[PDB]
Symmetry: D2
């Protein structure tokens, strides 16, 4: 099983001009590796992939991969609506030294099932890297069903995992039963902090969630306790993770909230976010600070 | 805080003629009280209230309350679309000796917010009993928001709880935060087996869920372990509760599955369900058995 | 084709104490027959079926059937969630002298397709009357697809039409293509005022819509002009029907608006509605008046 | 009022290698101008904007603008998820000689209302050109409400129109009332063939719809009859438009269908579409043919 455990969707740090901030991004990366995470996911939703151009995306992927320097496995989010660009980004990721790619379904047109299967087959066939699917139906408007994901895992042997970003115990349970039933080593990662514990108890593999960025120790220590067989200690961390997502209601998008949390929890970086996201105002930063303090996160 | 803990939505047991089966109903009630439940809820969704006439509802309430004979707190589900009837069913439940009523929002017309607040205020004023709200938006098509629930709890002091039937950590967390923040003794009970653990860890109060009928020991042992500070033990029971809901997929509606489970787990009753529900077939009964066996429930 | 043309969903008139107002209801019935409608539909959504008990429904049906006295075809809405009651209301409608019944799908539980087919088969077999289906997915949360409706028309020969209540050209077109393609005399009536014209141009058969109560001359004259080949005259009435539904925004439910409009347009009746509906306040009554006056309807 | 009447969302013609086909696109352009359209819209949804890179889009806009050579007004679709790119495409379109831009809301993140208002204000402030909004909630997952459109029309005087792409008489009626009530020359165009007639009768201004490509004469002729006060002639064209959208069911996306209809109605071009769209198979091409022949379109 590839890409198991805690694999944060790393924020991309930008300067005030909206250019990749190399020292800031590098420092966040080294904080996360230092914290014991199992891998790093660049250019996911929280990494602002959808607000970046293709060449910006390539430059960021290359920098991120080079800085990591094989210390942990690296995943690159290569999806979008332009399928030709997906292939271009996916092959670039492979050429630059990524260990895998993460591919969301096209989120403008909700393409027919036949087009959807064909889309994922051809992205898969375009690289010889492992491929992880990315389900985010709140944003895409099209759920990757456990049945369709099984079909894909049946069709292509490099389709080996999923980030299932959904607030649903049923979706996760059924994803694990349906797909891991047929494909024992298929990786099921939840996209939400507050589902890591259940995911593990259901027989899934970990999480790619936002709090990996500013509070990686909570998820890391939950996974460690769980693997140790210390279910009480695991559940104590889960109790914190249950409460964290209150801060994501502060703005939409909440990539600004995640970067301000990174700052408040001890890492000085530019908080700049790319439009149409916008800075978190002072009242909502104070609100964030008090929540992080209440959770003993800073 | 009223109605806390494990409060099963008791199945209504009927003979072949579609008439109340008093001995079957009595025996189920007596099984559940013996299992150590904290209360009994009659004529919830799983009790088939929506397939019953007003007079039959009154007959069932009467019989159930009298048999319970004050051994545990009793809730009666009195809602529907006919608000005159809701008031009639509520005052009947009070006169008959109920300890509280559970009231769903009208589920044909999704009435305006002003009509909805008025409805709930009107039914709460019709009785002097405690009133629990019932949120089940998958069936009602209209969610009872934490903000609207708070308004109701501010507005009437006998509106004291909610059964929040939803597969959503966010909805439960926000319910608890919003309403219990304002009303510390307001009772939050989840409607799904697989959210009990999370509900307790979030600061809520228990569950009214289907497995209460055929595996009450699992939720009962979970609540007891939790209240004893033995979180690992509680998590062990949660792991069973996480898996149980796959049986509910066998039919729609799944009131037939619940009764077949009661029989399989050791209580012989007739498993008759009211139209438009229909008998569970032999192949699906066979799948139910092996799931219950796999979970060590029979 | 049975039950074609203009068939108003007649409001039920009640006294201030919430009982059937016989003179008021009889006079509304007589206005509509005088206005040239093709049928009368009692106890539809606008007739407040979902707010009335079983015995009130029987009483209203009997009175309405008797007052009409075979001068136009009479339909009775017999649906609900209690399928045993649907059968008993449908059999009563037949014995009382109704010409057909209109049956909505169960709208609490969205039953499996197997259960849904079985339900409509059972109701259709309980009577030797014409059966019209009622699709209202905004309220039911479950669409009667053209495929499913064709399966029902294939299955029972007394399932002979549908009231399709949806703001969708595509749903109406596909309903007509699919069902009338296999059953040329299956009747398709739209449930909204502003789709009557399109329904006719698409090859369907008329409307059961709210404005049939207070402005029946608009629909009746549209249908007449269309059959006369005076398409420009039809389109002029259509322009009025396009603007009418802004008045329905005044309340939810808007059964109060419909009764107030009957009054405003010349027929003094009591405008009492059953909870959870409530009286229309004086400002919205005035707004309703100004909308009617703008459309030259009073 | 700017950009009224019939403004097709022009197909982008590509060669078998996926590059802009200049002579094919030029021929389509000249066919439409010659058919009497009131303007041309490049890089809408049907123009495959979402499957194209930013540089590809700039090349297409430049070529289409230069080929039209001021013969009719030209709109360019500039939107996407990357707001910085939206501004860059919008400024490029103005510098290239476009008459206006059409801007969809961001369709990955559904941004907060504040972020959404701010986005359209900054795109509008980036150009001195007329701006038309684009509502397509089936694809974006975020409806531009009549109330929000009116707030934008109040805020920026170059925000002067909307393409409202919705199967809804209610949405169109309310859009027209709310926004044109406040701004009499704000232009409301429907996005669907089968709502053109209702749009005009409601007080709106025309259509940007797929059949403008292959059957422009139907819409042009309808608009001409309407403006002539010959409503019966207009309604005869509408009867064809009511039936056209069956063909769009043949694939998702249906950009392939539109180009194959262009070919079947008499203009030989390459019918290549960009992934994740795919070629229409021979069976579905025949089906398209028979549908066009039935409507006397080829």
């Amino acid at each position: 099983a590839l890409f198991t455990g805690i694999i944060p969707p790393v924020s991309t740090i930008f300067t005030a001009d909206g250019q990749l901030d190399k020292p800031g991004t590098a420092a966040l990366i080294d904080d996360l590796i230092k914290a014991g995470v199992d891998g790093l996911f660049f250019l996911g939703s929280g990494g602002e992939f959808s607000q970046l151009g293709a060449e910006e995306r390539k430059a960021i992927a290359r920098f991120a991969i080079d800085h990591v320097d094989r210390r942990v496995p690296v995943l690159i989010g290569t999806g979008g609506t332009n399928a030709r660009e997906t292939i271009e980004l996916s092959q670039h990721a492979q050429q630059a030294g990524a260990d895998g790619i993460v591919v969301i379904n096209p989120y403008y047109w909700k393409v027919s099932e036949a087009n959807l299967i064909r889309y994922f087959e051809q992205v898969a066939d375009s690289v010889t890297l492992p491929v992880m699917l990315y389900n985010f139906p709140a944003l895409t408007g099209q759920d990757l069903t456990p049945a369709l994901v099984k079909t894909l895992a049946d069709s292509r042997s490099n389709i080996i995992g999923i980030k299932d970003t959904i607030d649903s115990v049923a979706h996760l349970r059924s994803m694990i039963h349906t797909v891991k039933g047929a494909h024992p080593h298929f990786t099921v990662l939840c996209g939400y902090d507050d589902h890591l514990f259940n995911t593990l108890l259901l027989g899934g593999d970990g999480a790619i969630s936002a709090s990996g960025n500013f509070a990686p120790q909570v998820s890391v220590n939950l996974l460690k306790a769980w693997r140790d067989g210390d279910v009480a200690k695991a559940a104590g961390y889960h109790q914190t993770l249950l409460q964290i997502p209150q801060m994501y209601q502060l703005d939409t998008p909440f990539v600004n909230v995640i970067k301000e949390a990174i700052v408040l929890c001890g890492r000085p970086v530019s908080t700049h976010v790319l439009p149409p996201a916008s800075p978190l105002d002072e009242p909502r930063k104070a609100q964030l600070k008090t929540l992080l303090q209440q959770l003993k996160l800073c």
